[PDB]
Amino acid sequence: IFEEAASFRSYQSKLGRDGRASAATATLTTKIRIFVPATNSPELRWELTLFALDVIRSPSAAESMKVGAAFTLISMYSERPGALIRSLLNDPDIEAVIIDVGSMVNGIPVMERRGDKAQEEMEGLMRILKTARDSSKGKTPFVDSRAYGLRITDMSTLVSAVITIEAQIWILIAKAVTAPDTAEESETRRWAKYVQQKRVNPFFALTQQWLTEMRNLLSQSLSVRKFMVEILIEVKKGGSAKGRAVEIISDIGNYVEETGMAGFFATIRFGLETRYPALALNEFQSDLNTIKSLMLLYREIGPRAPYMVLLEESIQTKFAPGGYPLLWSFAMGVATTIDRSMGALNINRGYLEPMYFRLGQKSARHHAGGIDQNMANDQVAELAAAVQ
Amino acid sequence: IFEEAASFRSYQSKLGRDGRASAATATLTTKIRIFVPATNSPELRWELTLFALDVIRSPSAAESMKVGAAFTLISMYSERPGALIRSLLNDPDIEAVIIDVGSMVNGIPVMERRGDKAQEEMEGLMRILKTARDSSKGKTPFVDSRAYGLRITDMSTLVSAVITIEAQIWILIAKAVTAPDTAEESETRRWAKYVQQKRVNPFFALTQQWLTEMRNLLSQSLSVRKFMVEILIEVKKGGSAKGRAVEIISDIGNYVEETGMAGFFATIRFGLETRYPALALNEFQSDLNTIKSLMLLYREIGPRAPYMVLLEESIQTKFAPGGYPLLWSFAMGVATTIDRSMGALNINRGYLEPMYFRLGQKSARHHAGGIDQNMANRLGLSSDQVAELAAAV
Amino acid sequence: IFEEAASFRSYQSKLGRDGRASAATATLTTKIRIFVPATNSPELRWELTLFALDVIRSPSAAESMKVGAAFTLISMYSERPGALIRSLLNDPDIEAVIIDVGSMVNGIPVMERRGDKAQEEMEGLMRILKTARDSSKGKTPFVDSRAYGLRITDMSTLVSAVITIEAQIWILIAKAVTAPDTAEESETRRWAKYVQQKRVNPFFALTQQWLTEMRNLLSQSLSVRKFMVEILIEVKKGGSAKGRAVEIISDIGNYVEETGMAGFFATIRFGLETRYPALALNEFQSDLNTIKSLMLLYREIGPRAPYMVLLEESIQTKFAPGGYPLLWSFAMGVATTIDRSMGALNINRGYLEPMYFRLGQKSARHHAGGIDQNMANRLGLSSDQVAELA
RNA sequence: UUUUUUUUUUUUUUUUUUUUUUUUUUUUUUUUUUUUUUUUUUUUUUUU
C-alpha cells in the first residue's frame, strides 16, 4: 500500500542509472608529455626530479607541461615510474606521451635523444630553469638551499629524499579540491605529524610559495587530480605489504578519504548516528526515506566513493547534503552545539532550515543527558546538568 | 530502518579493504648489507658482535650500514643467524644482500669474501671502528670495561652474553617508536626486572650512551623496525619449545603489545569495561556505533594488531585516539579519576571535549566511585551496604 | 552491543596464541656434559653421588659442568639414570651429551669412558675436587662429617641415602625460582615435616652451606629448572603406583604447585571466591571481565599451568597480578583483613591502589568480615544475633 | 497545458602502568551387658 510509494521513490532514484553511455559522448583527448624515470640509477633519477620540480616552479611553463610535470613529481615512488603511470592511469580526458628520462647529461635540462630539433627543446628547458630562478628571486623549490644543490649517488639517500618530496605533494591533495585557500593551517598540521613521526626528512621541505602555486594548479586542473585519485584508490586497497613510499601515501589517504563530501558525512555523524529524540518528528519521515535511498545509492557508487568530491563525480551531487534539508538543518543544529571543535566549518548555506537549526540546537543542550529518554536504559540529573 | 545506517557506517569502514593491491604500488627498494653469523664458533661470534656494536656506536658509518648492523645485532639469537633473518624478514622497502661472516678473520672487522679486489672494504670498516672509539672518547659498549675486552672462547659464556645484549635491544623497542624521549625511566624499570629475576646477565650490562645511540637508530629507521616486528609476531606464536633467547623476547613482548595505541585500549579499559550508566548519554549512541565498527574492524586486521603503531600500519589511523567521540573525552575523564596509575600520561589531544571530559570525572567521582549508585549487576544478595561503600569513598 | 566489547577483550587475549612457531626462532644450543649411573650397584652409586655433591660445591667448576652435575644429582632416583634424563629432558636451549660412568675408581671424579684423548680430563676432575675441598675450608656436603666419609656397600643404605639427598634438592625448587633470599625459613619448615614423618633419612642431612650453594645454582641456571619442572609435571600424573622415590617428589609437589603465581591465586581465593557485596560495584566490572578472560586463558594454557612462573613461560606475564589492578588491590585489602596467616607476604607493589585497598580492608573489616554480602540462604531464618556477634 | 529552490568550507601521529615476595605433614573416640510365653467373656426367653 504505502510500501509502493517508498519503493517508487527508490525506483526513481535508481531509474536510468544503469546501462552504458553512447560512445559519441567521449571528449577530444588532450596530449601531454610525461617524463618517467628510465631506471633506478640515482644520478639520472635525482636530476630528473629536480628538472620536474623546476618545471612546476617556473612562471613561464605552459599548463600542458605543468600537468605532465606534476605527474612526474608524484610518480617518483615507482621502481618503474613510467609503468606505474601507464598501468594505473585510466582517464578519457588525457592521452599521455611517456618519455623515459634516461641520462640527464645535457646540463640543467632533462635529456632528449631525438637529435637536432630536440636541441630547441633542451634550450626551452634552459629558459624554463633560468626563468624559474630569476622569477623566484633566487629561492629554489626547497626551503633550505644546500638541499636543492645536493647531488645524490646512493639508493638510500634517494628514497629518503623522494619519499619526502612525494609526501609533501600528497600533504596538499587533502584540501586542494575542497578549499585550497584557508589551506595552509591544515597542510602545516599534517606536515608536523609526518616529520614528528620521522616518516619525512625535514631537510627536504618545499617552499610555501611553490606549494601554494601548485595547490592552485591542482584545484583548477582535472587531469592531474584524475591520476592522483587513481593512485590514491589503488594503493588504499589492502592485502599487501608496502614500501615506505606507498605506505606514506596510504597513511595520508586516511586524512584524504571522505574529504569534500562534508554534507553526506555530516548527516551521518550528526543527527543520524546521534539517533536524537528529534528523529520522531513527522517532518523528518520524507528525509529518512531519502537517506535510505542515499545509503543504497552510496553502496552502488562503490570504489570511487571516498573521493567522489575530488573526482568532481556527478553522482556526488545526489550525495550532497542539501538533498535532505530538514534533517541537514537539524544535523547542523546538533553538530554546532554538541561537538566543540566542529561547527566552526561554515554550514551557512541558504537551504538551512530555521525550525531544524533551532530544534537541533534545542535537542541536545535543551534536554540534559539525552533529554526526554536516555537511549539505552534515578541518577540522571546533577552530573548531567554539569555535562550540558 | 535505522539498522541500515549502522550497517552503512560499517560498510564505509570496510569499503575497498578487499581485493589484492595493484602492483604499480611497488616502491623503489633500498639495497642494504646484512653481515650474518656464518657458523656458531665463539671467537667469530664475539668479534662479529663487537663489529656490529661499534657500527651502531660510530659517527662515521652511514645509516644504510647502521640499519644492517642493527639487524646483525638482533639476529645473534639464532642457531643459523642468516637463515633466521632471510626467512622471516619480509618487507619491500629494503632488499637485503646477506654476507655470511667467516668468523671475521682480518682483525676487529669482517673478512673480504672472495679476497679483496679492493681490500679497502676492511679499511672502510677500520675507519668506522676508529671513528666510533674516538667520537665516544674511548667509552666501550658495556658499563664495566672488562666486558669490552672479553675475547670469548666458549659456547656457555657466548649464549650468556648474546642473550644479554639481545634483551638489551628488545628493552628499547617498547618505547623507541612511541616516545623516544621521556624513555629512560621506563626502559631502566624494565632492565631492573630482567636482572633482578636473573634472566639477563649483569656482567654484560650496556652503557646509557650506547642505549641512547641505538634508541635513536630505532626511532629513525623503519627498515629495522620492520624486521623487529616480523620476529616479534613470529615468536609470539605458540606451539613449540621456547629456548632462553626466544623466551626473553616473548617476555619483553608482554610490555610491547598494544604499545603506542594508547587511545584505542583506553576507550576499552576506561568507559567501556567501566560500564558507567554514562553510556545512556545522547552523544553516546553514535560513539558506541563507532566502537562496534572499530572493534569488529580491529578483529579483521588480525596478526599485525598488537604492533600497529610500530609497523606504521595505516589502518592504525582508524584506531587513532582522535576519532573516537565521547570516549576520547569521557573515557579519559573516568580513567584519570578512577585509576591511580593512569593520568601520569600526557593527555594533550585536540579531540578532547572539555565538558564531556569533566562528565567522565564526575561519573566516577559522583560518590567517589558512584557510591550509593551504579552496581548495575544485581547478582549480589544485599542492598544495605551501597551507602557504607559511599561513606568509605 | 556491550557483549561485543567483552568478546573483543577475550579475542585480543587469545589472538596469536594459535599456529606453530617458525623454525628460525630455535635458540643457539648449549652443549653440556652429564655423567649418569652406568650401573645399579651402590659402590658406584655412593661414590658418584659424592662426586656430584662436590661438582655443585666447587668454587672452580664452570657453569656448564655445574648444570650437568645438577642433572646427575637429581637423576639418582632412576633404575636407569641415563634413560630417565634422555627420555624426559625436552628443552631447546640445552643439548646433553651423557656418558654413564662405571668405574669411578679414579678418586673424586669419574673414569674417562673410552680412555681420555688427554689424561687432563682426569686432572680437570682432580682440580675440580681439590678446589671444592679447599674453597669450602673442609666443610663437607653432610652436616655431620661421618656421613660424608661413609663408603656405601648395600642397596638398602644406598636408597635410604639417595632418597635423602634427592629430597634435599626438591626442597629447594619450591623457593629457588620465586624468592631465593628469605628462603631458609620455608625450606627448613618443609625439612622438619619429611624427617618427623620418617619419610627421609636424617643420617644423610645436608649442610646449610651446601644447600645455599645448590639453591643459588638453581636460581641462576634456567636449563636446570626446565629439567626439574619437566620431572615435576611428569611424575605428578596419576595412574601409577609410587615408591619412596616418586613419593618424595610428589610430596614436594604440594608446596611447588601454584608457586610464584601468587597474585593469580590470591585474587581467586580472596575477594573472588569470597563473593563480598562489592562485586557489583561498577568500578570493578571490567576488572571482573579481565579476571574471567584470565581464568579461561589459564585453562587453555593447560599442562604447564601449576608451574608457569618457574618455567618463565611468557603467557604467565599476562596472568601476573598487576594486570587486574582494581580487583587485586581490593582482593589484598580483604585477604590481609580476613585471613590471619596471609598478609605476611610483602605486597608493596605498584599495582596496589590505596583507595581500592582501603575499600577492601574497610569493606571486609567494617563488613564484620565479608558480612557486607552473604550468599548463603535456605540454611534457614537469618540470625540477627549471629550477625551482631560477627 | 505547465510555472519554486539545489557545488564546496571543521578536526584527526603519539605520550601512563605491568617480574616476583604468605601459610602448606601428623596427634581424639571405636567390643558386648535391658525385656520377653500362656491365663477374661461368648445358647434361648416380648408382641403379631
How far is Cα A169 from Cα A164, in angstroms, rounded to an integer?
9
Q: Alpha-carbon torsion B187, B189, B192, B194, what sign?
A: negative
At residue C178, the 3 state secondary structure works out as coil
Sequence-distant (≥ 6) Cβ neighbours of residue A27 within 8 angstroms:
A92, A93
Sequence-distant (≥ 6) Cβ neighbours of residue C146 within 8 angstroms:
none
Cβ–Cβ of B305/C2 closer than 8 Å?
no
The answer to whether C89 and C227 have CB atoms below 8 angstroms apart is: yes
The answer to whether A65 and A33 have CB atoms below 8 angstroms apart is: yes
How does C356-367 read in b/e, with b if 16+ C-beta sit within 10 Å?
bbebbbbbbbbb
Among A41, A103, A106, A245, smallest CA distance to A163 is for A245
How far is Cα C165 from Cα C141, in angstroms, rounded to an integer?
10
**Residue indicated by cell numbers 681490500:** B119
Q: Cα angle vertex B300, ends B299, B301, to 5°? A: 95
Query: Which of B257, B264, B389, B393 to mutate to test binding with chain C, by most C CBs within 10 Å of its CB?
Result: B389
C-alpha separations of B207 from A380, B17, B53 in Å? 57, 45, 11
CA atoms within 13 A on the CB side of C137: 1
User: What's chain C's length in residues?
Assistant: 390
For the record, the C-alpha cell of C359 comes out as: 575499600
Q: CA of C310 vs C1' of D2, distance in Å?
A: 91
Instruction: Write down the experimental method used for this entry.
Output: cryo-EM
Q: Which of residues 347-376 of A touch strand D (CB under 7 A)?
A: 347, 349-351
How far is Cα A233 from Cα A63, in angstroms, rounded to an integer?
25
3-state secondary structure chain A: CHHHHHHHHHHHHHCCCCCCCCHHHCCCCEEEEEEECCCCCHHHHHHHHHHHHHHHHCCCCCHHHHHHHHHHHCCCCECCHHHHHHHHCCCCCEEEEEEECCCCCCCCCCCCCCCCCHHHHHHHHHHHHHHHHHHCCCCCCECCCHHHHCCCCCHHHHHHHHHHHHHHHHHHHHHHCCCCCCHHHHHHHHHHHHHHCCCCCHHHCECHHHHHHHHHHHHHCHHHHHHHHHHHHHCCCCCCCCCHHHHHHHHHHHHHCCCCCHHHHHHHHHHHCCCCHHHHCHHHHHHHHHHHHHHHHHHHHHHHHHHCCCCCCCCHHHHCHHHCHHHHHHHHHHHHHHCCCCCCCCCCCCCCCHHHHHHHHHHHHHCCCCCCCCCCCCCCCHHHHHHC
Helix (H) / strand (E) containing C100? strand C94-101
The answer to whether A284 and A320 have CB atoms below 8 angstroms apart is: no
Strand partners, C96: C32
Helix (H) / strand (E) containing B34? strand B30-37
Helix (H) / strand (E) containing B54? helix B42-57
Answer yes or no: is A341 CB < 7 A from strand D.
yes
How far is Cα C68 from Cα C88, in angstroms, rounded to an integer?
15
| C150 DSSP 8-state letter | -
Which amino acid is it at C329? S
The answer to whether C335 and C347 have CB atoms below 8 angstroms apart is: no
The answer to whether C38 and C101 have CB atoms below 8 angstroms apart is: yes
How far is Cα A319 from Cα A316, in angstroms, rounded to an integer?
5
Give alpha helix (H) positions in C237-284: 244-256, 262-267
How many other C-beta atoms are found inside a 10 Å radius of the C-beta of residue B126? Answer: 15
How far is Cα B57 from Cα A384, in angstroms, rounded to an integer?
58
Q: In degrees rounded to 5, what are phi and psi of residue B97?
A: -105, 120
Chain centre to alpha carbon of residue C3: 39
Sequence-distant (≥ 6) Cβ neighbours of residue B333 within 8 angstroms:
B356, B357, B358, B359, B360, B361, B362, B363
At residue B31, the 3 state secondary structure works out as strand
DSSP for C290-354, please give it. HHHHHHHHHHHHGGGGGGTTTTT-THHHHHSGGGSHHHHHHHHHHHHHH-TTTT-S----TT--H
| B207 DSSP 8-state letter | P
CA atoms within 13 A on the CB side of A329: 16
**What are the chain A neighbours of B383 within 8 Å (beta carbons)?**
none
Q: In degrees rounded to 5, what are phi and psi of residue B181?
A: -120, 145
The answer to whether C374 and B382 have CB atoms below 8 angstroms apart is: yes
Q: Which nucleotides of D are covered by protein (CB under 7 A)?
A: 5-26
Answer yes or no: is A39 CB < 7 A from strand D.
no
The answer to whether C70 and C224 have CB atoms below 8 angstroms apart is: yes
Which amino acid is it at C63? E
Q: SS3 helix, strand, coil % of chain C, rounded to 5? A: 60, 5, 35
**What are the chain B neighbours of C283 within 8 Å (beta carbons)?**
274, 338, 364, 369-370, 374
How many other C-beta atoms are found inside a 10 Å radius of the C-beta of residue A164? Answer: 23
Among A142, A146, A117, A141, smallest CA distance to A128 is for A141
Cβ–Cβ of A273/B285 closer than 8 Å?
yes
Chain centre to alpha carbon of residue C284: 33
How far is Cα B268 from Cα B327, in angstroms, rounded to an integer?
9
C-alpha separations of A123 from A106, A116, B242 in Å? 10, 12, 68
For the record, the C-alpha cell of A102 comes out as: 634516461
The answer to whether C352 and C329 have CB atoms below 8 angstroms apart is: yes
Q: CA of B323 vs C1' of D1, distance in Å?
A: 56
How far is Cα C240 from Cα C253, in angstroms, rounded to an integer?
16
Among B163, B207, B213, smallest CA distance to B188 is for B207
**What are the chain A neighbours of B27 within 8 Å (beta carbons)?**
77-79, 159, 242-247
The answer to whether C73 and C224 have CB atoms below 8 angstroms apart is: no
Strand partners, B94: B30
For the record, the C-alpha cell of B102 comes out as: 667467516
Helix (H) / strand (E) containing B236? helix B222-236
Q: SS3 helix, strand, coil % of chain B, rounded to 5? A: 55, 5, 40
Helix (H) / strand (E) containing B155? helix B155-176
Query: How many Å from the N-terminal Cα to the C-terminal Cα in chain B?
Result: 45
The answer to whether A53 and A225 have CB atoms below 8 angstroms apart is: no
Which amino acid is it at C282? N
How far is Cα B315 from Cα B319, in angstroms, rounded to an integer?
7
How far is Cα A201 from Cα A206, in angstroms, rounded to an integer?
11
Q: CA of A300 vs C1' of D45, distance in Å?
A: 124
At residue B211, the 3 state secondary structure works out as helix
Among A46, A41, A67, smallest CA distance to A204 is for A46
| C101 DSSP 8-state letter | E
Cβ–Cβ of A240/B279 closer than 8 Å?
no
How far is Cα C316 from Cα C261, in angstroms, rounded to an integer?
8
Considering all nucleic acid strands, name the nucleotide whose C1' atom is nearest to the C-alpha of residue C316. D19
The pairing of strands C30-37 and B30-37 is: unpaired
Sequence-distant (≥ 6) Cβ neighbours of residue B204 within 8 angstroms:
B142, B147, B160, B161, B164, B165
The answer to whether C50 and C133 have CB atoms below 8 angstroms apart is: no
Strand partners, A206: A142
Strand partners, A387: none
Note the resolution in Å, 1 decimal.
Answer: 4.3
How many other C-beta atoms are found inside a 10 Å radius of the C-beta of residue B345? Answer: 11
Q: Which of residues 226-255 of C touch strand D (CB under 7 A)?
A: 254-255
**Residue indicated by cell numbers 623566484:** A136
The answer to whether B93 and A245 have CB atoms below 8 angstroms apart is: yes
At residue B100, the 3 state secondary structure works out as strand
Cβ–Cβ of B27/A244 closer than 8 Å?
yes
Q: Alpha-carbon torsion B296, B300, B305, B308, what sign?
A: negative
How many other C-beta atoms are found inside a 10 Å radius of the C-beta of residue C211? Answer: 22
How far is Cα C72 from Cα C63, in angstroms, rounded to an integer?
14
How far is Cα B271 from Cα B261, in angstroms, rounded to an integer?
16
Chain centre to alpha carbon of residue C380: 45
